[PDB]
C-alpha cells in the first residue's frame, strides 16, 4: 500500500450530516498518517478509547470507520461510551467496549446563520434507546399516549425530529460543533489500514 487514508476529506468536508442521520465513511487499504490530527489549533476535543493517541501511527486495523455529524457544544460530552442524553440515546450511540477516537471543534462560523440555520436536526423522542452504531432516520409521529396518531402531529403526538436553529450569537453551549468519530475495527482478517511505522 502507498495511498494515504483520506482523513482530510472527512475533517475538512464542507457539509456535515445531521446527527440523527449521521454520516459514515469506510477507510480501508491505506496508510494512515494521524499526524495531521496532532496539535490542531481548532480541536476542542480529542479523546481516544482503548488505544492511546500517541501510539496511533504504530497500530494496524482491519478497517477504520469515520462517522461525522453536527451537534451542540453541550452535547459533545455525550459522544463517548457510557453516556446518556438525547444524543447518546436517540441519535448516535457508542458501545461500552468502544475502540476509537472522538474529535470535535466549534463550527459557529460555518453552521450558524443570523436568523437560524434549521438544516441541522436531532431526534428528540424514541420508543427505545439506540443500539451501538444504529442509525434511525424514521419520521414516524411519536405516540406519547394510548391514542393512535395516524401519522398526524397533535395532542400526545409529536413529530420526532427537532431543529438546532443555530445562530452565531448563541452561547458556546448552544453553538454548532462538528464531530468525527474514528472507529478502529479489528477482525480475524488481514489489516488493511496501517500507520506509517507499520
Amino acid at each position, epitope marked *: 500500500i502507498t495511498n494515504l487514508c483520506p482523513f482530510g476529506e472527512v475533517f475538512n468536508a464542507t457539509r456535515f450530516a445531521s446527527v440523527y442521520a449521521w454520516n459514515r465513511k469506510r477507510i480501508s487499504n491505506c496508510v494512515a498518517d494521524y499526524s495531521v490530527l*496532532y*496539535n490542531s489549533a481548532s480541536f476542542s476535543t480529542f*479523546k481516544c478509547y482503548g488505544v492511546s493517541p*500517541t*501510539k496511533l501511527n504504530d497500530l494496524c486495523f482491519t478497517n477504520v470507520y469515520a462517522d461525522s455529524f453536527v451537534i451542540r457544544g453541550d452535547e459533545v460530552r455525550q459522544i463517548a461510551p*457510557g453516556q446518556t442524553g438525547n444524543i447518546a440515546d436517540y441519535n448516535y450511540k457508542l458501545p461500552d467496549d468502544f475502540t476509537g477516537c472522538v474529535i470535535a471543534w466549534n463550527s459557529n462560523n460555518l453552521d450558524s446563520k443570523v436568523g437560524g440555520n434549521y438544516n441541522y436536526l436531532y431526534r428528540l423522542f424514541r420508543k427505545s434507546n439506540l443500539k451501538p452504531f444504529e442509525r434511525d432516520i424514521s419520521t414516524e409521529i411519536y405516540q406519547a399516549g394510548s391514542t393512535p396518531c395516524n401519522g398526524v402531529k397533535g395532542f400526545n403526538c409529536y413529530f420526532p425530529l427537532q431543529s438546532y436553529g443555530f445562530q452565531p450569537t448563541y452561547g458556546v453551549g448552544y453553538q454548532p460543533y462538528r464531530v468525527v468519530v474514528l472507529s478502529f475495527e479489528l477482525l480475524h482478517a488481514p489489516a488493511t489500514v496501517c500507520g506509517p511505522k507499520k
Partner: antibody
Framework: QVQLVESGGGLVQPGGSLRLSCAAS????????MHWVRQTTGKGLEWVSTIGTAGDTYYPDSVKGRFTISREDAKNSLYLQMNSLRAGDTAVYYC??????????????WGQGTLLTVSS | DIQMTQSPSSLSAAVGDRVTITCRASQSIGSYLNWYQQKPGKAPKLLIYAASSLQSGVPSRFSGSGSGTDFTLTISSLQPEDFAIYYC??????????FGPGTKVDIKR
C-alpha cells in the same frame, strides 16, 4: 537504571510564569512518551500534560492556553512552561514516563517531584 | 471524564495479614486499570497494570484482580514497608487519565 529528576520548582507570584525541567537517564528518551502529573492534598493525583514521540501534545482543559509541554531529545530533557499561574496551581509536579504493553498504557517511572508554590 | 472511587479510605492491619482494597470506575473500563503505591515523600510506584499484570520487580505478594467497573488490589501478607497510600488509575480514556483518591494502609503493631 531509569532515572528522572525534576528541577525548577519554587516560589512564584500569582499571574507569574515559571518553567519546570525533567532530566532523564537510563533509557532511549526519544522512544517514550513523557508526562507531567501534579499532586495536591485536596485533589490527589491529576494529569497535567502529555507529549508523545511525534511532537504531539495533550492538555486538560484547565491547563490549555496556560501551560506548554515540550521536549529536547538531544538533551534527554522534558520541559513544562507555565504562564498565568494561580494559587490553585500550587502542587508537587512529577515527570513520568509512559509505556504500554499491548493496548494497556501505564506510567512506569516517576521523578521525585518538585514543589511549586504560588504566593504573593 | 471517568471518575474513580476507592474503598476503604484507610485501614489498619497487622504484619502477615491479607489486605484487600477495591477500586470502582464510573463506567466499564474492561481491564484498563493500573495500581500505584506511594510512600511518604516519594513518587508513585507502579505495582499493577492491565488490571492483573504484576510490574517487573514488584514483590509477588501484590496482586490485582477485577474487570469492567470493579477491581481489587490484594496484599497477600502485609509487610511493614507496605505502609502507604495505594491509588488506582483507569487507562481506558486518553489523554485524560484519571486516578482514584487513594486508600491508606497503616500497620497495626
Amino acid at each position: 537504571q531509569v532515572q528522572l529528576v525534576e528541577s525548577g520548582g519554587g516560589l512564584v507570584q500569582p499571574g507569574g510564569s515559571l518553567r519546570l525541567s525533567c532530566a532523564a537517564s537510563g533509557f532511549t528518551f526519544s522512544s517514550y512518551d513523557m508526562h507531567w502529573v501534579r499532586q495536591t492534598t485536596g485533589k490527589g493525583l491529576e494529569w497535567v500534560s502529555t507529549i508523545g514521540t511525534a511532537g504531539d501534545t495533550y492538555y486538560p482543559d484547565s491547563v490549555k492556553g496556560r501551560f506548554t509541554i515540550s521536549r529536547e531529545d538531544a538533551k534527554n530533557s522534558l520541559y513544562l512552561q507555565m504562564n498565568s499561574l494561580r494559587a490553585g496551581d500550587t502542587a508537587v509536579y512529577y515527570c513520568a514516563r509512559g509505556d504500554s504493553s499491548g493496548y494497556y498504557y501505564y506510567f512506569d517511572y516517576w521523578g521525585q517531584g518538585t514543589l511549586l508554590t504560588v504566593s504573593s | 471524564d471517568i471518575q474513580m472511587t476507592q474503598s476503604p479510605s484507610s485501614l489498619s492491619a497487622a504484619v502477615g495479614d491479607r489486605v484487600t482494597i477495591t477500586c470502582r470506575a464510573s463506567q466499564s473500563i474492561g481491564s484498563y486499570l493500573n495500581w500505584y503505591q506511594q510512600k511518604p515523600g516519594k513518587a508513585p510506584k507502579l505495582l499493577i497494570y492491565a488490571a492483573s499484570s504484576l510490574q517487573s520487580g514488584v514483590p509477588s505478594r501484590f496482586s490485582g484482580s477485577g474487570s469492567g467497573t470493579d477491581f481489587t488490589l490484594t496484599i497477600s501478607s502485609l509487610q511493614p514497608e507496605d505502609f502507604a497510600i495505594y491509588y488506582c488509575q483507569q487507562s481506558y480514556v486518553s489523554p485524560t487519565y484519571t486516578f482514584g483518591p487513594g486508600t491508606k494502609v497503616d500497620i497495626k503493631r
